[PDB]
Copies of this chain bind each other. A is one copy, B any other.
């Protein structure tokens, strides 16, 4: 019984995620995706200023 509990703890150490850090990484990745989509929305229309010359 102790041996099976040790193997379960070892498999969990081999695989289990660090969720307390995963919360911060997710909260940062959301802001990164939002800044990236806003940057793409800025990039889309810079060529369009050429119409002002004509």
Interface residue ranges, A against B (CB under 8 Å)? 19-20, 23, 26, 50, 53-54
Chain B residues with Cβ under 8 A from A20's Cβ?
A: 50, 53
Chain B residues with Cβ under 8 A from A23's Cβ?
A: 50, 53-54
Copies in the complex: 2
Choose from B19, B26, B50 the contact partner of A19 (Cβ within 8 Å). B50
Q: How far is the CB of A29 from chain B (nearest CB, A)?
A: 14
Cα-based distance from A45 to B54 in the complex (angstroms):
37
Cα-based distance from A26 to B54 in the complex (angstroms):
9
Q: How far is the CB of A12 from chain B (nearest CB, A)?
A: 11
Could you list 8 examples of A-B contacts with CB < 8 Å? A19-B50, A19-B53, A20-B50, A20-B53, A23-B50, A23-B53, A23-B54, A26-B54
